[PDB]
RNA sequence: ACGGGGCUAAACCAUGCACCGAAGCUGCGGCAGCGACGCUUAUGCGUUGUUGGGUAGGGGAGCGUUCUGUAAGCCUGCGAAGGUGUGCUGUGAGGCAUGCUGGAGGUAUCAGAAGUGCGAAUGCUGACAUAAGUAACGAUAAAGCGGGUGAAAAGCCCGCU
RNA sequence: CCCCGGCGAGGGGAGUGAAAAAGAACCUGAAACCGUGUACGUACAAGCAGUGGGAGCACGCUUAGGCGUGUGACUGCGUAC
């Protein structure tokens, strides 16, 4: 029962090189380099599913901070005021109203200034 | 209609013939023949005989006219190499490649 | 001896080529870590 | 829904003019770097230049505290061996005073192609006059 | 002295960006025979500048 | 493998991986690492396990309606056409015939029918009792299997 | 000899209230292991508690390849194996369908047996790169011209130096 | 058999054959490697060359929109096995 390897080994190598499309040089042509590059792309993709949640909250906070200072209050006093006024809107929606409905953001600031005073 | 002539297993490397084939790509065949006449390369002799043969194939087999033909495609491919042995110092042997090439000229009046 | 070389059948003893201490230009002052 | 990003073909940029007479050097430079980057706008995007154009007048009259007018030393190297060169704050003011504000603002900007394009919107002058009246710069009393 | 890394096909084509041939631009036309030739060279019939210089 | 035991090159100095034999299984044309021998693949079955397996197979042929008991089953001349006509008169196509002791008219007539095996009662085996669709035993063959299986 | 810019606080001490900050904790959705109790199981489901970083190493469960039986069956010139694309699908090894190429083989299911899975061993054999159109073209005794032949002559033939 | 070519090599027709990209360097014809064409990017820009975000352009769809494919300016993180 002698087994030859040609059909199985080619399909395994072709699966790796399909995932390595777009890569530079030997990373899209050569199996020894492409296999190594597909694994490093998988460690990066796992790590950046965690960093995607940090980088968007960092972006929302900087946009709330900019729009709150257009109404005379800082970020840390605007968040404290919305917590005292029991407003449960999160930073993703607050940064979105700050861009698309600037009047409705002013109404939230006056709600937060009222609870602090 | 396109018309092809080829020289297969031409005894020169593809890198040396590709320098001459880049001179006449896209030209009218009247202009391309006189560029090849005054190019001082051995590959210019080889490309001229393939272009002269593609011209004659288009007149005879395709009924074309000479004053409207242009070099639409021209490309040089690598052929098989002949392995030779070269003695070096102190008992060393190197391996000599004698590279060949495939020349392909396509003339078209459109 | 290397008796069945297909790349170089003409030669059997070849370490005068690549072994540094067996070349004809080897000097013993290269071996000074003593 | 995806988060808004500013598109560079539709970015609103404005023109301002700042008088630097008697201002502290670093406290003026942090506000300059905020507005060149665009941190004061709600449309802020970290990879888009959404900032403003700023004209700075009277760069030779900026102020520093302490003994920094004789003790702040600016270093650079020329690339040749032994070629380290220094200059005090007063030597920079007396020779090329627009460089003092430009160096301080460049160190507060991001490093890369985008921060080099943010720096291009800063227009520093040593005197009280500029020739950008066609851009109609608004007086920013910061 | 020899390389520590294999240079790429990108680096090979950048070096060959100065290897291109220049074509001769203006063959002259002899004013008696009408034959094309190089400038300041005789024709293949042996004319030069209107007269038969090489009776061959 | 045919070849000598000469070391292909020396141990140290040539700048190349060390070798000791041209017949190494790493090399092309070299030996097989765990090259095989002729072996005996036969297993032992206990006598009671062989007889206990036959009684279960025979009980399933009674249960799954695949066992046929007649009293007579033979042909009259050693002709293939006689048995093929006889079996389609009984709606039997693929069948094992077990008889008491073997008639040679029947043994010759079924040598060409590829779906039909004719056996005597002692030459049964557990695989052909499962591999054929129907099993026809004569009435004198059934009493021999009972004395064989105690 | 602040990470830098810069700083007379943007430094230090004391007190206070905010906010940022991790794969920690919470929220929502999903999978699996080990206990406990049960619509009742026939060995699976339901409820609940808890657990799930991992080398050496121990335990458990699977994928795929070639060959044998099932198979004188089933699929296939109305196109098999192989090759090359695309779509769908599973937690994974993988699976399924189909366009083009190819031109005669392939094989379900449940079992059985292994030359059963490769990136490394200065592994072995073949093919092809790189340096690179780079070094070199083998004695520094030496060539010049006219004619001939030829598709083509610095090197061949003839002649004179 | 005709044509180019040195009464070459090699090729283009024609013809045979189910097929000549089955043409004798001959079944199938993978990969490394080398070219031609097209779309997008690229000549103020610093590093394991990816990954997360993402504008523009091109080509398909199908609509009272924004999806698919290719490319990837700019930007956070990131020193192969
Ligand atoms: N006795 C002389 C044998 C020579 C051989 N080719 C060698 O290289 O040894
Ligand atoms: K021997
Ligand atoms: K197929
Ligand atoms: K290896
Ligand atoms: K080369
Ligand atoms: K010489
Ligand atoms: K074929
Ligand atoms: K081929
Ligand atoms: K290929
Ligand atoms: K990036
Ligand atoms: Mg030599
Ligand atoms: Mg010798
Ligand atoms: Mg070595
Ligand atoms: Mg063998
Ligand atoms: Mg016995
Ligand atoms: Mg038979
Ligand atoms: Mg620090
Ligand atoms: Mg908080
Ligand atoms: Mg978190
Ligand atoms: Mg967390
Ligand atoms: Mg957790
Ligand atoms: Mg674990
Ligand atoms: Mg854990
Ligand atoms: Mg089988
Ligand atoms: Mg198969
Ligand atoms: Mg297919
Ligand atoms: Mg094996
Ligand atoms: Mg391998
Ligand atoms: Mg390994
Ligand atoms: Mg071979
Ligand atoms: Mg070979
Ligand atoms: Mg080599
Ligand atoms: Mg060099
Ligand atoms: Mg040189
Ligand atoms: Mg030289
Ligand atoms: Mg010589
Ligand atoms: Mg001479
Ligand atoms: Mg002569
Ligand atoms: Mg034909
Ligand atoms: Mg046919
Ligand atoms: Mg055949
Ligand atoms: Mg073939
Ligand atoms: Mg091919
Ligand atoms: Mg540029
Ligand atoms: Mg510059």
DSSP string, A19-65: HTTT--GGGTT-HHHHHHHHHHHHHHHHHHHHHHHHHHHHHHHHHHH
Please name the residue that has the structure tokens 């032992």. Answer: F44
Q: Outline where DSSP puts E strands in D34-131.
A: 53-57, 73-77, 84-88, 122-124
Count Cβ atoms within 10 A of the Cβ of residue A89 and give its class: 0-12 exposed, 13-18 middle, 19 or more buried.
exposed
Q: Phi/psi of residue E36, each to 5°?
A: -80, 145
Chains that touch A (3 or more CB pairs under 8 A): D
Count Cβ atoms within 10 A of the Cβ of residue D60 and give its class: 0-12 exposed, 13-18 middle, 19 or more buried.
middle
Question: Of all helices (H) and strands (E), which one includes residue E25?
Answer: none
Q: Which residues contact F40 (CB under 8 A, 6 or more apart)?
A: none
> What resolution does the deposited structure have, in angstroms?
2.7
Listed in sequence order, the DSSP H helices in E1-56 are 9-15
Listed in sequence order, the DSSP H helices in chain F are 47-63, 80-88, 104-109, 128-131, 139-148
User: Ligand 1: which of C3, C8, C12, C15 to mutate, most ligand atoms within 8 Å of CB?
Assistant: C12
From CA D123, how far away is CA F113, in angstroms rounded? 106
Q: Outline where DSSP puts E strands in chain C.
A: none
From CA E31, how far away is CA A13, in angstroms rounded? 69
Give pairs for B65-68: CB < 8 Å, separation 24+.
Answer: B65/B109, B66/B29, B66/B30, B67/B30, B68/B109
Could you tell me the two tokens for F107? 């043994």
From CA C11, how far away is CA C14, in angstroms rounded? 7
Neighbours of E47 (CB within 10 A): 19
**Residue F107 CA from chain centroid, whole number:** 19
Q: Phi/psi of residue F69, each to 5°?
A: -110, 120
Answer yes or no: is the C-beta of C10 below 6 A from any ligand 1 atom. yes
From CA F23, how far away is CA F20, in angstroms rounded? 9
Helix (H, G, I), strand (E, B) or coil at B45: helix
From CA D133, how far away is CA D136, in angstroms rounded? 5
Whether B66 CB is under 7 Å from strand H: no
In terms of CATH, what superfamily is F1-149?
Ribosomal protein L4/L1 (3.40.1370.10)
Q: Which residues contact E36 (CB under 8 A, 6 or more apart)?
A: B34, E27, E28, E29, E30, E43
Domain assignment of residue D19, given as a range:
1-142
Q: Are strands D73-77 and D84-88 parallel, antiparallel or unpaired?
A: antiparallel
Q: Experimental technique used?
A: cryo-EM
Q: Which residues contact B62 (CB under 8 A, 6 or more apart)?
A: B1, B3
Compute CA distances F82 → C26, F115, F119, whole Å.
99, 15, 18
**Counted domains in chain D:** 1
Neighbours of E45 (CB within 10 A): 14
Answer yes or no: is the C-beta of C12 below 6 A from any ligand 1 atom. yes
Calculated CA dihedral for residues A73, A79, A85, A88, nearest 10 degrees: 140
Listed in sequence order, the DSSP H helices in D9-51 are 25-37
From CA D51, how far away is CA D11, in angstroms rounded? 9
Q: Are strands D15-19 and D138-139 parallel, antiparallel or unpaired?
A: parallel
Question: Of all helices (H) and strands (E), which one includes residue F119?
Answer: strand F116-120
Tell me if A27 sits within 8 A of A37, measured CB to CB.
yes
From CA F48, how far away is CA B93, in angstroms rounded? 76
With CA atoms as reference, report the closest residue to A31 among A53, A16, A46. A16
First to last CA, chain E: 56
Measured N-to-C along each axis, helices A102-116 and A91-100 cross at an angle, to the nearest 10 degrees, of 130
Tell me if D114 sits within 8 A of D6, measured CB to CB.
no
Helix (H, G, I), strand (E, B) or coil at B9: strand
**Counted domains in chain E:** 1
Nucleotides of H under 7 A from a protein CB: 2-5, 8-13, 25, 30-37, 44-46, 48-56, 70-77, 80-81
Please name the residue that has the structure tokens 């021209």. Answer: B74
Across F30-52, b (16+ Cβ under 10 Å) vs e yields eeeeeeeeeeeeeeeeeeeeeee
Please name the residue that has the structure tokens 């404290």. Answer: A80
Atom 9 of ligand 1, residue of closest alpha carbon: C12
Radius of gyration of chain A (CA): 26
Could you tell me the two tokens for B62? 């395709």
Could you tell me the two tokens for A24? 């530079």
Q: Phi/psi of residue B13, each to 5°?
A: -75, 155
Q: Outline where DSSP puts E strands in D1-142.
A: 15-19, 53-57, 73-77, 84-88, 122-124, 138-139
From CA F55, how far away is CA B46, in angstroms rounded? 89
User: Ligand 1: which of C7, C10, C15 to mutate, most ligand atoms within 8 Å of CB?
Assistant: C10
Atom 8 of ligand 1, residue of closest alpha carbon: C11
From CA D106, how far away is CA D119, in angstroms rounded? 7
Compute CA distances A71 → A78, B103, D52, F129, whole Å.
10, 75, 20, 94
Cα B78 to averaged position of ligand 43 atoms, centre (Å): 13
Q: Which residues contact C16 (CB under 8 A, 6 or more apart)?
A: B90, B91, C22, C23, C24
Q: Outline where DSSP puts E strands in E1-56.
A: 28-29, 36-37, 47-48, 51-52
Q: Which residues contact E35 (CB under 8 A, 6 or more apart)?
A: E29, E43, E44, E45, E47
CB contact under 8 A, C16 and B90: yes
Compute CA distances F46 → F54, F60, F121, F127, whole Å.
13, 21, 21, 17
CB contact under 8 A, F13 and C19: yes
Across A41-80, b (16+ Cβ under 10 Å) vs e yields eeeeeeeeeeeeeeeeeebbebbbbbbbeeeebebeebbe
Domain assignment of residue E17, given as a range:
1-55
Give pairs for E21-29: CB < 8 Å, separation 24+.
Answer: E21/B19, E21/B20, E21/B22, E21/B23, E21/B39, E21/B41, E23/B23, E23/B35, E23/B39, E24/B35, E24/B38, E24/B39, E27/B34, E27/B38
CATH number for the segment(s) B1-110: 3.90.470.10
Nucleotides of G under 7 A from a protein CB: 4-10, 18-23, 64-67, 70, 72, 82-86, 93-94, 113-119, 121-126, 128-131, 133, 138
Neighbours of D137 (CB within 10 A): 19
Strand order, beta sheet including D53-57: D122-124, D53-57, D15-19, D138-139
């Amino acid at each position: 029962a002698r087994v030859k390897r040609g059909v199985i080994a080619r399909a395994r190598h072709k699966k790796i090189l399909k995932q390595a499309k777009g890569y530079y040089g030997a990373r899209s042509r050569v199996y020894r380099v492409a296999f190594q590059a597909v694994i490093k792309a998988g460690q990066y993709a796992y790590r950046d599913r965690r960093q995607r949640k940090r980088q968007f909250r960092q972006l929302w906070i900087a946009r709330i901070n900019a729009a709150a200072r257009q109404n005379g209050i800082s970020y840390s006093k605007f968040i404290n005021g919305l917590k005292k006024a029991s407003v449960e809107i999160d930073r993703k929606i607050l940064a979105d109203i700050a861009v698309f409905d600037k009047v409705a953001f002013t109404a939230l600031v006056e709600k937060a200034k009222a609870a602090l005073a | 209609m396109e018309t092809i002539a080829k020289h297969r297993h031409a005894r020169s490397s593809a890198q040396k013939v590709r320098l001459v084939a880049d001179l006449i790509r896209g030209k009218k065949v009247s202009q391309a023949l006189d560029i090849l006449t005054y190019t001082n390369k051995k590959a210019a002799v080889l490309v001229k005989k393939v272009l002269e043969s593609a011209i004659a194939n288009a007149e005879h087999n395709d009924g074309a006219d000479i004053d409207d033909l242009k070099v639409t495609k021209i490309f040089v491919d690598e052929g098989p190499s002949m392995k030779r042995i070269m003695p070096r110092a102190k008992g060393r042997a190197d391996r000599i490649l004698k590279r060949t090439s495939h020349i392909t000229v396509v003339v078209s009046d459109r | 001896m290397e008796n069945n070389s297909r790349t170089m059948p003409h030669i059997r003893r070849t370490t005068h080529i690549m072994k540094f201490a067996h070349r004809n230009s080897f000097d013993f002052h290269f071996f000074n870590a003593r | 829904m995806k988060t808004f990003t500013a598109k560079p073909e539709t970015v609103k940029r404005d023109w301002y003019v700042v008088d630097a007479t008697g201002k502290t050097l670093g406290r003026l430079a942090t506000e300059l770097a905020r507005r060149l980057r665009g941190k004061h706008k709600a449309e802020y995007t970290p990879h888009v230049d959404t900032g403003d154009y700023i004209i700075v007048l009277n760069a030779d009259k900026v102020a520093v505290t302490g003994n920094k007018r004789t003790d702040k030393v600016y270093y650079h190297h020329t690339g040749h061996i032994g070629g380290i060169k220094q200059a005090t704050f007063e030597e920079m003011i007396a020779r090329r005073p627009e460089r003092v504000i430009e160096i301080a603002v460049k160190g507060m900007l991001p490093k890369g192609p985008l921060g080099r394009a943010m720096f291009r919107k800063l227009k520093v002058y040593a005197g009280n006059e500029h020739n950008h009246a066609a851009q109609q710069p608004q007086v920013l009393d910061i | 002295a020899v390389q520590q890394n294999k240079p790429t096909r990108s680096k090979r084509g950048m070096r060959r960006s100065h290897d291109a041939l220049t074509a001769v631009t203006s063959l002259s036309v002899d004013k008696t025979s009408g034959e094309k030739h190089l400038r300041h060279h005789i024709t293949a019939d042996g004319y030069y500048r209107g007269r038969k210089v090489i009776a061959k | 493998v045919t070849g000598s035991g000469k070391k292909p090159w020396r141990q140290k100095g040539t700048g190349r991986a060390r070798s000791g034999s041209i017949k190494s299984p790493i090399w092309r044309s070299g030996g097989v690492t765990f090259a095989a021998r002729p072996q005996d693949h036969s297993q032992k079955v206990n006598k009671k396990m062989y007889r206990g397996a036959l009684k279960s197979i025979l009980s399933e042929l009674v249960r799954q309606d695949r066992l046929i008991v007649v009293e007579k089953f033979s042909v009259e001349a050693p002709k293939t056409k006689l048995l093929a006509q006889k079996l389609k008169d009984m709606a039997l196509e693929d069948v094992l015939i077990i008889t008491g002791e073997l008639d040679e008219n029947l043994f010759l007539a079924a040598r060409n029918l590829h779906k039909v095996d004719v056996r005597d009662a002692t030459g049964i085996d557990p695989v052909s009792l499962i591999a054929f669709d129907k099993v026809v035993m004569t009435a004198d063959a059934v009493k021999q299997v009972e004395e064989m299986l105690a």
